């Protein structure tokens, strides 16, 4: 016989069992080899998708810049994605969007943005994804990269006293006119053993500008540099304030909330219907959503939004796009040469491709030759493409701007379209009097979408009567999208320490149970699974378990003493006392009342050398020896110098970590005067010697000498 | 900023003026109708394209066995386990060797082998190592086998290479390679039908204790978990899950234990036997059994992703099939004794034993996600449990027990007739499907499912007669075709989707049958 699982889809509805089509139980795919192929292919798809032959030589770069907006090379394939944005109709969508909600929409949202950004310390710029450090020309976590940028500014022009986002931006734009910049760059010196001695390097305005506009590839997603990031955060906060106020917007609001947004708009549309009118829905999905959008149109739109707001923050809004209007894209790892012998291989840098030229296969040559126009030594310059992931907020602002207009254009019978959008994904509802008119309505809305560069995917998208559609792995019916496939990998141990791991896993099972709507026995088996993987991860097993080991050998003598062996903590060998009803309650609390007095007293002492319960079990994990062996440590010699400083101030000021230190004083001054106050405290009443207090005073003033000399 | 502006205007001030002073007229209706005339295409009708040209399938050699271990044909060696002896789990094979395992040796001339002498020598090195200690000391042997017979290629710098471009030697070129497509597997169906039936051993998967219960919920939850666990533990699918967890966990420990070293890791699964004949007996048997022996190469971790190389040796009682086993190198190992006791005579004599060998690559990510296979249970549980609630919640009664036994799920086809089984035994089908999703997951599979949801949603669109439509079905079927290459599970679910389309079109026709 023949076993076909899909046969169970015959009788049952698909939306309930849809979680079995997704194979989230297994590992994901991932990248191998060189990413240069995808990068070049994507740049050629960017210049291709932008249909214009107009090319103007840049004055500064002596490189052709193709600025394509409000101009069209039409290709016989219209249905294929277009990258060209008509800015007049764009700002038309902005006007109709504003005049739909309030007359002060943009002024007010920009007011909120100006508020939140002008408050902002630039240190919060370290919060975020990995970004491109141009000092060492490598990708780094944002904090270390920003430390290298600011540190380089300090060693070049002197320390940075700005302490605000605005002054940081002012310094960023000031550095573009700098003719010389100094870096901390570790150079290997052969002393023959190579010791990577730290060094100070110089660079010229010409190279520094390209390094500042440089973006890096991640096997693909792009990670922009440190000088571009603050302005990008500015625009992203503006567009976030715009997104929040939009009912049709799904970007700023998500999780359990997106669900109810869709429900509300659904019943609203169902009530809005007439007896003649006909409603139908489509699930839209967009391909090459980032390659089609352009920072030039974003510059025009940002100029339209900031028109009335302030001329002080408007110049601060327009600066973010222009860094993506002239932007440099790093090519990648490069290509490798081989013989038929499979013996000798010759690695090539991304710089030296144009040396080997035709030696590459004809496909590589056909993709490569046109890009020699816009090529630089290490990097390729393109104006019009928008790198993915950076501007997503403003992207959905654009989408909602397309969906917002129904009253506009013609009052033709049954002209209605509205829906939800999050970045590329969008759900469209269309209402028309007769069925033949529906095709016309849908086509008009796809016509404006492709008019400003939003290209629906003709392969991926599909539509039907209102009951069926999908949004971001949320499938709809009379019922609502019961799937656990989204949250699967997070069920496993969190990995910090034992109590936090198990209690956090429990609360995860709770929250998933409320939102993702999994059933109770599912959450019970999830509890048992998380408990087994917890016990294996931390190498502990129950006392009644026959399993013998290192930690269990102690439990062999432990068992006879304690009267209540169920009340023991799991990490000490106790059996599971928690259940679905107790999920909100951490295991330490539920077991605490039934613990033996000796046990509970010995285990919870705060003096131990070793929602979250601290107990005794929380510890810190050692970092591996990897980053310390390379010159990354030779760079970390600065970060450690920050270390002993922060640790010192935390030893002097106990609330330093909890309450951020404030007041107008130097760190050293407050440390000194506070040390004097504690010395007077312990001398006057408590027990310490007077000559010892004068010794402390001597150390303090002798420290003031070396502090003054600097 | 002044050369960044889109418009014919150059100075930023002019673009600023056109922005601030902009007032749009209602001319985008004619702009949109001319844009409509320019965009001629994409009206869409289901009944027009309702054929969907069925589904395209690749043609070529039959798809091979991609699982890191053998399932249906794999053979077991039973050992009753000691708590302190088996607690190591590395010494498990050392106590196995005191049995009959040490005597088995393959002949020099294999059936269907690619690299016989190498594998035979390595087998002798495993047997010799197990006697002393489970690390293999050969520094020359592993260097050729690692990388998947991957060779370390010497690198010539570009600086000295320019002359070799001027004088071309070593035949300098550049090329990349693509995977060769395969064809729909036959054996896969038999593999599913074998993983579906209950093995003689009771359960393979460690599962923790049940928490204390209150009448209301935890009675329902605890009971449902006891029943579902009881059903799914006895299946052979649970067997492969258990061996995957235990052995891939063993390798996971061996990568931290001895980096850059060669170690002999057993392939094993733990099981306790259960007897339903009587209550009173001496004891239910508690033991662990051995599928085969495994070998690990250098575990060093690159800055980019490293992938470890692994050599698998499995026992089998079964004649190899060249079509699905093409990656495996088979030997004639020996003879193994198998007997039973029944009401009949059931002597059993002996059956020849074959030794299957191969080499595969394991990424650390694959080591992790394959190391935890228990997740599958959950994804089955939810899918099952919902069906029992949605039904019972209609009748506002407890139908869970009644729905499990009474509700019929379409399972397979036999003699051209559509067959269905109750939800409790058809639960094994879902568990096997999720376990294959875990084992067989490739980028091809994820493209397949993520583009397949559209097919399913159109199907249920025709199910309730909602007149669903997808815009370029040729393009959709080209994307589905594009993601079908060598993956056995991918092509299998493809063909089964074809049969679903056929039977659904027979029920009522919004589709086509060739």
């Amino acid at each position: 016989m023949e076993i076909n699982p899909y046969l169970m889809f015959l009788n049952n509805d698909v939306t309930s069992l849809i979680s079995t089509t997704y194979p989230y139980t297994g590992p994901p795919p991932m990248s191998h080899g060189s990413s240069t192929k995808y990068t070049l292919e994507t740049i050629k798809r960017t210049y291709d998708y932008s249909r214009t032959s107009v090319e103007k030589t840049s004055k500064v770069f002596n490189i052709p810049r193709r600025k394509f907006c409000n101009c069209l090379e039409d290709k016989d394939e219209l249905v294929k994605p277009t990258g060209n944005v008509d800015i007049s109709s764009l700002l038309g969508l902005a006007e109709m969007m504003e005049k739909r909600m309030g007359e002060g929409f943009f002024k007010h949202c920009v007011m909120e943005a100006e508020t939140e950004i002008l408050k902002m310390h630039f240190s919060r710029l370290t919060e975020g994804r990995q970004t491109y450090d141009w000092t060492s020309e490598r990708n780094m976590p944002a904090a270390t990269a920003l430390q290298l940028t600011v540190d380089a500014i300090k060693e070049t022009e002197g320390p940075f006293k700005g302490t605000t986002m605005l002054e940081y931006c002012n310094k960023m734009i000031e550095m573009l006119d700098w003719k010389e910049i100094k870096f901390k760059k570790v150079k290997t010196v052969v002393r023959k053993t190579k010791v990577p001695v730290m060094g100070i390097d110089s660079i010229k305005h010409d190279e520094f500008l390209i390094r500042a506009l440089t973006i890096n590839t991640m096997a693909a997603i792009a990670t922009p540099g440190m000088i571009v990031r603050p302005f990008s955060k500015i625009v992203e906060t503006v567009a976030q304030k715009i997104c929040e106020k939009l009912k049709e917007s799904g970007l700023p609001v998500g999780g359990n909330e997106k669900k109810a947004k869709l429900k509300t708009t659904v019943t609203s549309l169902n009530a809005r219907m007439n007896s003649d009118q006909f409603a139908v829905n489509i699930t839209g999905d967009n391909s090459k959503w980032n390659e089609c959008q352009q920072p030039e149109a974003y510059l025009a739109l940002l100029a339209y939004i900031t028109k009335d707001s302030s001329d002080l923050m408007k110049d601060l809004c327009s600066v973010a796009p222009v860094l993506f209007c002239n932007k440099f894209v790093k090519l990648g790892q490069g290509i490798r040469l081989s013989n038929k012998r499979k013996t000798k291989e010759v690695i090539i840098k991304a710089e030296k491709m144009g040396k080997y030229k035709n030696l590459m296969r004809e496909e590589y040559k056909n993709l490569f030759e046109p890009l020699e126009k816009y090529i630089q030594k290490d990097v390729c310059f393109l104006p019009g493409g928008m790198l993915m992931g950076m501007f997503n907020m403003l992207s959905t602002v654009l989408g909602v701007s397309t969906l917002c207009y129904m009253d506009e254009e013609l009052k033709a019978k049954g002209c209605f379209w509205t829906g939800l959008q999050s970045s590329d994904d969008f759900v469209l509802f269309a209402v028309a009097s007769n069925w033949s008119n529906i095709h016309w309505t849908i086509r008009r809305f796809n016509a404006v979408c492709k008019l400003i560069g939003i290209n629906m995917s003709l392969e991926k998208s599909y539509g039907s009567l209102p009951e069926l559609f999908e949004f971001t792995s949320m499938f709809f019916d009379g019922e609502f999208v019961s799937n656990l496939a989204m949250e699967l990998p997070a069920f496993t141990t969190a990995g910090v320490n034992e109590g936090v791991d198990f209690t956090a896993a429990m609360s995860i099972i709770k929250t998933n149970m409320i939102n993702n709507s999994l059933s109770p026995s599912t959450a019970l088996m999830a509890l048992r699974i998380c408990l087994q993987e917890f016990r294996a991860t931390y190498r502990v097993h129950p006392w009644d378990s026959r399993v013998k080991g290192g930690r269990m050998k102690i439990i062999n003598e432990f068992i006879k003493t304690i009267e209540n062996k169920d009340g023991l903590l799991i990490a000490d060998g106790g059996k599971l006392m928690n259940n679905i009803s107790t999920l909100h309650i951490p295991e330490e609390v539920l077991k605490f009342e039934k613990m033996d007095e000796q046990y509970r007293n010995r285990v919870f002492n705060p003096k131990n050398p070793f929602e979250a319960v601290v107990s005794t079990h929380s510890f810190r994990t050692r970092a591996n020896r990897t980053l310390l062996n390379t010159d990354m440590r030779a760079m970390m010699a600065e970060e450690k110098r920050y270390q002993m400083v922060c640790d010192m101030f935390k030893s002097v000021f106990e609330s330093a970590d909890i309450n951020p230190p404030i007041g107008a004083m130097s760190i050293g001054e407050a440390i000194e005067e506070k040390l004097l106050e504690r010395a007077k405290m312990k001398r006057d009443i408590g027990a310490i010697e007077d000559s010892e207090y004068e010794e402390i005073k001597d150390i303090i003033r002798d420290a003031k000498k070396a502090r003054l000399e600097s | 900023r002044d050369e960044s502006v889109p418009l014919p205007f150059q100075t930023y001030e002019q673009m600023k003026d056109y922005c601030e002073k902009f007032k749009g007229n209602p001319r985008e209706l004619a702009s949109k109708v001319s844009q409509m005339q320019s965009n001629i295409k994409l009206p869409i009708k289901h009944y027009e394209q309702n054929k969907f040209r069925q589904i395209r399938l690749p043609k070529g050699p039959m798809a091979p066995y991609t699982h890191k271990f053998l399932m249906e044909e794999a053979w077991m060696f039973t050992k009753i386990s000691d708590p302190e002896r088996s607690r190591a789990g590395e010494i498990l094979i050392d106590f196995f060797k005191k049995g009959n395992l040490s005597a088995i040796r393959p002949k020099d001339k294999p059936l269907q082998g690619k690299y016989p002498i190498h594998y035979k020598n390595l087998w002798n090195q495993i047997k010799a190592a197990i006697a002393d200690r489970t690390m293999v000391i050969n520094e020359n042997d592993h260097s050729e086998f690692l990388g998947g017979i991957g060779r370390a290629s010497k690198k010539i710098p570009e600086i000295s290479l320019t002359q070799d471009v001027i004088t071309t030697e070593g035949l300098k070129q550049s090329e990349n390679k693509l995977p060769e497509p395969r064809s729909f597997p036959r054996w896969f169906n038999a593999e599913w039908m074998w993983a579906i039936k209950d093995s003689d051993l009771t359960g393979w998967v460690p599962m923790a204790e049940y928490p204390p219960a209150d009448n209301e919920l935890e009675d329902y939850a605890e009971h449902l978990n006891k029943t579902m666990e009881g059903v799914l533990q006895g299946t052979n699918c649970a067997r492969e899950m258990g061996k995957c967890i235990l052995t891939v966990g063993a390798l996971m420990t061996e990568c931290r234990l001895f980096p850059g070293k060669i170690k002999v890791v057993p392939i094993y699964a733990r099981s306790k036997e259960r007897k339903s004949m009587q209550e009173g007996l001496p004891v239910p048997s508690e033991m662990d059994c051995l599928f085969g022996i495994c070998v690990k190469s250098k575990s060093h971790l690159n800055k980019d992703d490293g992938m470890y190389t692994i050599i698998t040796f499995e026992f089998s009682i079964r004649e190899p099939n060249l079509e699905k086993h093409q990656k495996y190198t088979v030997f004639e190992a020996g003879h193994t004794t198998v007997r039973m006791k029944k009401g009949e005579s059931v002597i059993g004599r002996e059956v020849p034993l074959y030794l299957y060998c191969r080499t595969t690559a394991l990424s650390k990510i694959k080591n992790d996600w394959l190391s935890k296979a228990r997740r599958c249970f959950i994804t089955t549980m939810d899918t099952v449990e919902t069906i029992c609630l949605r039904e019972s919640a209609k009748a506002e009664e407890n139908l869970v027990e009644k729905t499990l036994n009474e509700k019929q799920m379409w399972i397979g086809k036999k003699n051209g007739e559509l067959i269905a089984q109750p939800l409790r035994e058809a639960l094994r089908v879902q568990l096997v499907q999720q376990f294959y999703f875990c084992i067989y997951n490739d980028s091809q599979l994820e493209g397949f499912c993520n583009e397949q949801k559209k097919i399913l949603m159109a199907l249920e669109g025709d199910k309730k007669n909602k007149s669903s439509f997808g815009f370029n079905p040729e393009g959709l079927l080209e994307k589905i075709e594009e993601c079908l290459i060598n993956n056995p599970m991918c092509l299998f679910m493809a063909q089964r989707l074809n049969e679903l389309v056929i039977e659904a079109s027979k029920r009522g026709a919004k589709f086509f049958k060739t």
Binding site: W435, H439 | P43, K45, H46, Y47, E48, N465, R507, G508
Partner: peptide
């Protein structure tokens, strides 16, 4: 000039 489809009844 784009045609329509009226689904006579259902399919099951």
């Amino acid at each position: 000039t784009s045609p329509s489809y009226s689904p006579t009844s259902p399919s099951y």
